[PDB]
Structure formats: C-alpha cells, structure tokens
Symmetry: C3
Subunit: 306 residues, 3 copies
C-alpha cells in the first residue's frame, strides 16, 4: 500500500491486517517506554480546511512512534496559500517530509495529490466523501469492544442521508460476514437509495427504523451520528427531531449495546449517559491513536524509500 | 500531587520542594546536555483564551526535558470546537497526552477539567483566578536572587486591585515567615479589602503607600505590575498615573532591591533601567523554564 | 559567524564554506538514519509577518538535525504581541532557545535583534532588504546543478526593480569570477540604477534585455521571479506583461539552461514546463533543507558556549 485515499481501495483482508498492527501499537503504548519505530521520520499535516481534532490525533500518533511533525493548516487563507496550487504545495512538502496527511475541499484532492507526491498520502477526507483512517478506527472500536466484527447487530441513529462517516462504515461493514444493520432516522434523513441497493446486492440483512424504540436489546453497537440544523431550518422542526433521536440515560441503562460516536457530540447524547458502562465514544476516540500509529507505520514501511 | 490548580492547595513545604527541584532543573540546563527525563512523554497545551507567552514557556520546558508537545489553542470558536464541551475535550486529550496545561475562561474550568482528566492538569490560570506556575516561578526568582523568601521586604507597584498575579503572589508569600509587604498604588487601584483581611488574619506587617518615594532603601524586591488604560478611560488621568508609578533609572540607581515584572512590560519600566544591576525581570523570565521543567517532571513522576 | 543578517556580511570564501557544509548535510539526508547533530538544541521561529513556507523549511531542517523547534508567529496582531517590543521578545526567546530565525517588517529589525539576542539570529528577511538563507540556497542550486558558480551565464526574468531575492542573488554572484548576467524585464521593472552601478564598479559583463527571445542558448541558468499585480493596476497592462515573460514549453525544450524560481510560482512558469529536464525549481525547493541545516548547524557550533 503506497497511499490511503479511500476505504474502497482496501479489502477485508488488508483491513484486518491493519487492525492487527493497530492492536500491536496499542500494546506498545502500554509498555510506556519511548517508542522509536519512526524515529528519523517527519509527518506533514497539510490541512486546507482546518480540523484541530484530526491533526492532534495524527500528530500524537506520529510522535508516539518517535517521529517528528511539521504542520501547515489554514492553507485556505491567501496568507497561508498565496495563489499556489495544491499540486505545487504537495510537491514542495513531499520533498520536505516522509509522509503527508492531507485535508482538502475539492473532490480529486487526495487522489490527485497522491499522484504528485513522492511520499505516501493519508486522506483525512475531502471534508467528506472519504475518511479511511476514521472508518478504520471505528472498526477497531467494534473489534476491540465487541470482540468481533462478523455477525454483529449494529444500529445507526441520526442523519443517515448525509452522514459520510456512516456511509463509509456501512460500506466497510458490508465486507464482513452476517452483519445486521439498523438505520434509525427521521423520514427525511434516510440512508441513500443507492447505498441500500449496494446492501441488497451484498445480501445484507438490514432494517430502516423511524424510532429508537423500534430497536431491540440484541443490538451490539449503537453508532450515533450528528443531525445538524441545516437539515431543519425551522427551529420547531429541529427541536422535535433532536428530542426524538437524543440518546438519553433511561434508554441506555441495561442495554447490551455499546454507544459509539465519531465526535464531537453536542445534542446526540445526554451527558448523564457518559458514565454509563455502554458509553464507549471516548474509548473510540483513543483508539484513533493506535490505528493511526498503525497506518503511519505501515505506509512508511510498505514504501521503504531509504 | 496529581494536579496543580491553585496556589491555595500548596503549602510552604511543597513550595520549597518545588523550588528545590527547580534549582536542579536550572543546573541541568546550564550543563547544556540533552536531557531525556520526560523522553516518552507528551504535553498537551489546551488554550481557550490564547497566550503565546505561557504556551512557549511550557513548550520549551517540556522539550528541554526531552518530551514532546501537541498544541491546541483558540478553542473558543467554531474553528476548533464546533460546540464540544470542555469536559469532552479534556477527556479526548486526556487520552492522547500524558499531561495537560489548561487555559480556560470559566471559573471552575481547571478544577473541573482535573475531575474528568485521567492525566495531571496544570492550571495556566482560569483566565485570572489562579496562575500557580507563574507564582511559583516568582517565588523561585526571589529565592534565587534574594537568597531567601522568609523575612524579606517586598513592594508591589501598579494595579493592585485587579492584579491577579500580584494577589496570587501575595497569598503565597503570606505562607512564609515575616515577609514585609508594601502596596504602592493609585488611590483607585488599592489591594482588595478581603485580601488585606487575610493578611491581617495572618499577622503580616504590611503598608499601603501612595508613592514610590514613600519606600526606603530597605526593600529587597520591587514587583512591578501593569496598569491598563481600562482603569483610567480619561487619557489625562491615565497619563498622570503612568508617570507617577513609572520606574525610572534615576530612581533605581543605587537601590538595594531587584526589579521583578511578570511581563510583558510596556510603560511600567523605562528601557534605560534594563541594563541596571537590579533589573531582574528578564532573568525572572528565564527562571520560568526551570521551574516549569520542575513542575512537569514532578507531576508526571508523582503520578506513576 | 555569530549571526546571519545580510549576504553583504559574507564573502565568497565563507559562502563556499557554507555550500560545502550544505553538500555534507544533503548527503547525510540520503543516509536514511536519524541525525542527532543538533540533538539538545531548540530553534525559535519568531515571525511577525507570517510565512508558512520559510517556517516549514527551517522547521524541517532543524528537525532533520535532530533538534527541537518552538514557533511564535504573527506577533503583529495585538493578540500575540500585547504591546511588547521586539527587543523584549528577542530577549525572552533568546533565553528560551538556542537559535532564532527572525522575520520582522522594520528595517533595523534583524540587525537590532541580533544586538539584544544572547543567541544567533538568522534573518528570514525584513521582506524588503535581505534574505540570506534564500540567496545561499540559490547559489547552492547553481553550484549543485551547473557544477560551478564562477563563469556562468545567468538570466533573470521578471520584476527586477523590486525583486529583493534577485537583488540579493545578483550581489552574491557579483563576488564570483566572470559571471555573465542578463536582466530580462519590462521597461518599467528594470534592475535598480544603483545596483547596475555596483555591477559596473565590479567590472561585470551584464545586459539588460526586454524580451526572452533576446537570449541565446549559451545560458546556464534562468532565474524566474514573480511580477505581482500591484505593478500594473490596469488588468489589460498586467495581462500584457504576464504573457510577454511567461516561461512556456515551446521556449524551454532543448535549451541548455536550468530554470530556477524561489517559489511560489503562479503565472511565471507554465505547468507543462514542470516535467521538462531543465525545470529545477522544485529541486531548488528541496535544497533549502540541506543549506538551512548547514546554516543552523554552523551558527550553533560557531557559538558553542564561546
């Protein structure tokens, strides 16, 4: 693997390979003794559309492996860009660092950048459409907390029509055996038609539900996604929707499932749910470090341009 | 010690312990040898209200001990948070790093953060409630330059009514034996009533003075604090106040005291005072590194 | 050498010494294996007027030598400065780090800073009088790609009246033996009168040309500089000028020269020129790392507890 642009370029086999490397990295974090696997390496954080969350995650991961990091964000402003094209920037940075994590608005972006980069490119998503590293850490969370990915019952709650990370995860999961999916969402924000078709094409047991009460205590994972205002300009409307899908304490208690959420959470989950056993979104947050360490390591080794 | 939230959680004992560790750190620096005391460690700089000064200080300190640093500033915006609560952020960062230096506006902030952090939290002031690390380095400066903290005569000049770092230092000093305090300031910015009460309660010889000339050459330390235009909207007014408390060269020359100033200084001290022997504010600036190295080291070790 | 403020403080001898050290650094980079030459050192990036490019360059260089870096950009905004003078800041940072790369608007700036710094100061240009490190890497590019600096034919294209990096390079080159210079530019943006005088005073064969076709293929280096809008408020005019000096394919193919450009390039050079053999601007970009490593190393050693 010379780049990590899209989950659709990876198969269940490579996914597992990565999840394994991730577990190794997690254990290494427990040795607690200074790691130097990527000692003489430099990671370049090239963000056009800022994301302190994603940067810090990758930055931490790189440093945990003993590597160095140079950052270049807010490339969008003319002060941090200066009319220079992505292509020129990728070529210059490509010459400075050993690996690049890119975040660009345009669609080709990542893919294109990889074409001009003499270095591996990790796509931190083109804003949306494709964030591999996120999906991978999601899978790792399930693998880690549920003990397996195959044959699990997962339920997604929230904007499923525009939830990119949800789409990406639904696709990845569709590569595993017997995954039962539940899509809880407002009538308007249902899972894209074409996506459902792919699920059908892969003979995947799935159900579209309109209420959280439709779900049973047999779901293993409850993946909560945000529902932004832009979908319901009318406050009244938005109000009803928030209340209808908000994960409350009384609903969580005793449930078998674990609660995941890519963060940041704002309204999707009550704060009194945090201290409940099934709340796992912050653990999920942590898992991003080990899998990102896994990815950085792999990408660099796989392309030993020594 | 698992956190450093307020000076009021530390006693003279622990203070001295810290000042000692600080000295060690200072010496380790002077030798000029790559240090690796905090080698595999990561410090997280979580600033909601930006402060390049404080960040750089702690960043340098952490790196001098061979540690790594991840920074996250200006959270107070839809350019980094997007509506995520301090509590959620602390929990996420807490899982990434090994130690966190927080800077937040809200009062509980630091303390609260420490409750949700699975990692030590160093309070870089909840805006202007308590800035431990600063007071500690101030103490270190006195200890270092005067040779002792106990029984010294210190004079504070400037906005004493709102000078947070001054209040914090006055409290810490009140924990030492026989410290004589002088509060030089405009009739408008005198030291808070309740603070004076605490000083009285601790039987501390102190005097409020209106002029810099009301002092005698028996002062060991002259701690200069800033006085902002926001206190005297009227330029005329402000103008006269600036002149009245500005530390000038012909006032300094020959004086026993050392001049301290938490920085940045703008009007409080003339530039011709800089090269005078008693000017110690830049040295004080430096001392921040060793004491912060001391604090980072301790907090991490203490929490094995 | 205790500071690097201006190219006019360096002689051909020292220049070559630096270019040599630079080569060493370049080869050290090829030696894929962690360098620790500046292990316990800390570089401070003090930029009042931001420049993500220069910062990243120096940051990379410092980290490649195994050093650490603390950054402090745009103290220009009353947010990062607070009314504190450059002198006070230099003194404080001077006490924190081991070496400082300054970028300030005012003229004295760098020089002045060096007076109050208890640490070496590398001038990243007052943005209008001297950027040593850039000129040095330019020289290194010629030295490395052409094989020599002495007796070469170099042609500068673009705003030569305000091109600071061009002026700095023209001066440095004037210290070498038999360098033939060509100044291709619009009648308005001709090389400053006083500069031409210095060239005359040093008996330097030079020609001022108005067209790129005025150049014969006996040229070794074509240094392309930008021509910003502010020089031709009238779009018509500007468009006119852009087309007249734009380096196109049809013009480059088969030419003996190598093309240099300090970057970022916007209009000055067509993208189809990039993959042509004589295109060397991105290589030039890279060379900044080795020479900056060279400079950082030297400045720190030259001042090792003197």
């Amino acid at each position: 693997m010379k780049h990590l642009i899209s989950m659709k370029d990876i198969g269940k086999e490579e996914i597992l390979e990565i999840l394994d490397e991730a577990r190794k990295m997690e254990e290494l974090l427990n040795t607690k003794r200074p790691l130097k696997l990527l000692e003489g390496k430099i990671l370049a954080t090239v963000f056009y559309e800022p994301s302190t969350r994603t940067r810090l995650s990758f930055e931490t991961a790189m440093k945990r492996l003993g590597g160095e990091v140079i950052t270049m964000t807010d490339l969008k402003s003319s002060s941090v860009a200066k009319g220079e094209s992505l292509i020129d920037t990728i070529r210059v940075i490509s010459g400075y660092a050993d690996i690049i994590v890119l975040r660009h608005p345009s669609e080709g972006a990542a893919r294109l950048a990889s074409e001009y980069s003499q270095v591996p490119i990790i796509n931190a998503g083109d804003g949306s459409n494709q964030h591999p590293t996120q999906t991978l850490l999601d899978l790792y969370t399930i693998m880690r907390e549920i003990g397996r990915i195959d044959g699990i019952k997962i339920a997604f709650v929230g904007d499923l029509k525009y939830g990119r990370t949800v789409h990406s995860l639904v696709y990845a999961l569709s590569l595993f055996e017997n995954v039962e999916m539940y899509f809880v969402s407002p009538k308007e924000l249902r899972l894209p038609k074409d996506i459902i078709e792919d699920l059908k094409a892969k003979n995947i047991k799935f159900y579209e539900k309109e209420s959280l009460d439709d779900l049973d205590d047999d779901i293993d994972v409850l993946y909560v996604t945000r529902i932004q205002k832009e979908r319901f300009p009318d406050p009244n409307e938005y109000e009803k929707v928030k209340g209808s899908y908000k994960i409350k304490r009384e609903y969580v208690e005793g449930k078998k499932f674990i609660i995941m959420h890519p963060l940041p959470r704002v309204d999707e989950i009550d704060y009194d749910v945090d201290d409940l056993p099934q709340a796992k979104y912050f653990k999920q947050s942590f898992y991003g470090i080990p899998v990102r360490m896994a990815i950085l390591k792999k990408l660099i080794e796989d392309n030993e341009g020594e």
